[PDB]
């Protein structure tokens, strides 16, 4: 896999890792950890 | 793959491809009847330009699809019973259907001289 | 086993591909069977078993090998004479069919079809120059020999 295409996966995994933090407390209230 | 890997079921069907007209392809029907919910205009994508006449239709099965109105000029409006057939507007997203012009309520182009079968236009009967 | 014939098919190709005059093969009852078939078919020049070093080429046929007992059986080896004509090897391809993972057995009714350029089973028709060797009760014969003797058996390899 080229480096240009690897950066497409890099942006997807970061925005997801960044999303699971923001909604971590909300998922803890509903018992969805 | 080794003969053993094939014995355990490694050969699986290929991932399905979406049909051009799912509402018709799913139930193996060539056409369906629907009540026109809205007659508006859709704009093509980057290359093409213009105002494509479309119609939001609620099929008999229950699906709400968007069909394309072929020809020049139509006479359908809200609460119009129209016949939907497969097809797709290659430049309009979501417009994955066509409307038969010799259909129940949709009339054919009266000023059409070529390809009348495609637009539901009776012969002029000039001499007759 | 059939694994030995597969190794023999690959080596004979690599030797012909390298344009070698002589070629060595492990001395086994199965290898000698196919070797005699290749020689009887006209692909190799001669077959003589000897030690780890090739016999004297000047007296290849006249070579008198020593008895094969348990004191030297681990060092014996079959020395094959390869053939080259018109700037092209006579044993170019030795594609095998029956591999250790699967043994392909053919019937007389099918070999009669494969012998005339028509597929039958997991085999394909034989074209000009091609040749198919079959291991049967009467030894490792050729598809045209087995068809004459009216027998089937185990398909070993296809020679071009």
């Amino acid at each position: 896999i080229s480096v240009r295409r690897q950066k497409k996966l890099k942006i997807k995994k970061k925005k997801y890792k960044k999303l699971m933090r923001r909604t971590r407390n909300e998922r803890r209230k509903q018992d969805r950890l | 793959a080794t003969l053993n890997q094939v014995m355990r079921g490694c050969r699986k069907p290929q991932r399905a491809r979406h049909a051009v007209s799912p509402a018709l392809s799913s139930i193996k029907s060539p056409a369906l009847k629907g009540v026109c919910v809205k007659v508006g205009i859709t704009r093509p994508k980057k290359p093409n330009s213009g105002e494509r006449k479309t119609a939001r239709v609620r099929l008999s099965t229950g699906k709400v699809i968007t069909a394309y109105i072929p020809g020049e000029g139509h006479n359908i409006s809200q609460h119009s019973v129209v016949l939907v057939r497969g097809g797709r507007a290659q430049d309009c997203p979501g417009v994955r259907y066509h409307l038969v012009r010799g259909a129940l309520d949709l009339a054919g182009v009266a000023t059409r001289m070529s390809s009348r079968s495609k637009y539901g236009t009776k012969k002029p009967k000039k001499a007759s | 086993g059939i694994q030995q014939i597969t190794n023999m098919c690959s080596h004979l190709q690599n030797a012909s591909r390298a344009r070698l005059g002589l070629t060595s093969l492990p001395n086994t009852k199965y290898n000698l069977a196919l070797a005699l078939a290749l020689h009887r078919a006209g692909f190799i020049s001669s077959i003589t078993r000897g030690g780890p070093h090739p016999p004297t080429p000047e007296a290849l046929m006249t070579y008198e090998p020593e008895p094969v007992t348990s004191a030297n059986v681990a060092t014996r080896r079959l020395w094959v004479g390869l053939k080259y004509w018109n700037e092209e090897p006579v044993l170019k391809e030795l594609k095998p069919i029956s591999k250790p993972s699967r043994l392909v057995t053919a019937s007389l009714e099918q070999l009669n079809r494969v012998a005339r350029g028509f597929p039958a089973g997991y085999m394909k028709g034989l074209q000009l120059g091609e040749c198919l060797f079959v291991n049967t009760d009467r030894g490792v014969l050729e598809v045209r020999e087995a068809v004459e003797r009216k027998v089937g058996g185990l398909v070993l390899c296809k020679v071009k």
Binding site: - | - | R19, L20, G21, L22, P52, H53, P54, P57, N86, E87
Partner: protein, 224 residues
């Protein structure tokens, strides 16, 4: 694949087919090249076929999986061991020039080593001692050392006379009014002078050069 498809061995097969028929269908084929019939019955030789090379030494019998079965082997004779023993005992025998340029190859036809060291066509050198030693050691059944001594002493008696001739031949020529040129001892010394002088020029130049480096180390530009 940096190579190219060379079809030099099939120039006849190719030319024979191109000359069999005519491109213009309906006409007889024109005459073939003038060389097509000359080599009609002289096919090429088989090339690119690795045979079992000639074995100049008994191959290792204990090897179970021997390699290099298509590698030319080294040519070693029984004389190679004798040449090394002699020339090592007589290192300065190599300074005596020896010509290895053959005239017609027919030098081993007049060599009869049963007569002595002096043979026809070849000079008296360490080889004559070796060939004489090998003969006695084989024919007369002598040992390596015994034959070596006999063949070695005959070599000295012949070399001694050679050195005695140079001395007497010169002394004899001057007794009747015979003068010669510059001997090798004098010429050799004159050459050393021309070279020694050139070295002196190089020494004085570098020596003076180093003085500048020694003075340039310290600084005295102020001129106090």
């Amino acid at each position: 694949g940096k190579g190219r498809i060379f079809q030099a061995a099939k120039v006849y097969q190719r030319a024979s087919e191109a000359a069999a028929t005519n491109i213009v269908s309906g006409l007889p084929p024109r005459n073939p090249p003038l060389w097509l019939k000359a080599i009609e019955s002289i096919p090429p030789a088989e090339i690119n076929t690795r045979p079992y090379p000639i074995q100049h030494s008994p191959p290792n019998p204990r090897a179970r999986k021997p390699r290099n079965l298509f590698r030319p082997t080294k040519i070693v004779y029984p004389e190679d061991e004798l040449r090394r023993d002699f020339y090592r005992d007589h290192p300065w025998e190599l300074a005596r020039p020896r010509m290895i340029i053959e005239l017609d190859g027919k030098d081993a036809r007049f060599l009869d080593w049963s007569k002595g060291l002096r043979q026809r066509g070849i000079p008296l050198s360490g080889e004559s001692v070796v060939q004489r030693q090998l003969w006695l050691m084989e024919n007369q059944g002598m040992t390596k050392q015994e034959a070596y001594d006999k063949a070695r002493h005959e070599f000295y008696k012949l070399r001694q006379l050679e050195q005695m001739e140079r001395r007497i031949a010169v002394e004899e020529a001057r007794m009747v009014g015979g003068y010669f040129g510059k001997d090798l001892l004098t010429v050799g010394m004159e050459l050393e002078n021309k070279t020694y002088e050139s070295w002196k020029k190089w020494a004085t130049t570098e020596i003076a050069r180093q003085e500048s480096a020694r003075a340039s180390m310290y600084t005295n530009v102020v001129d106090n």
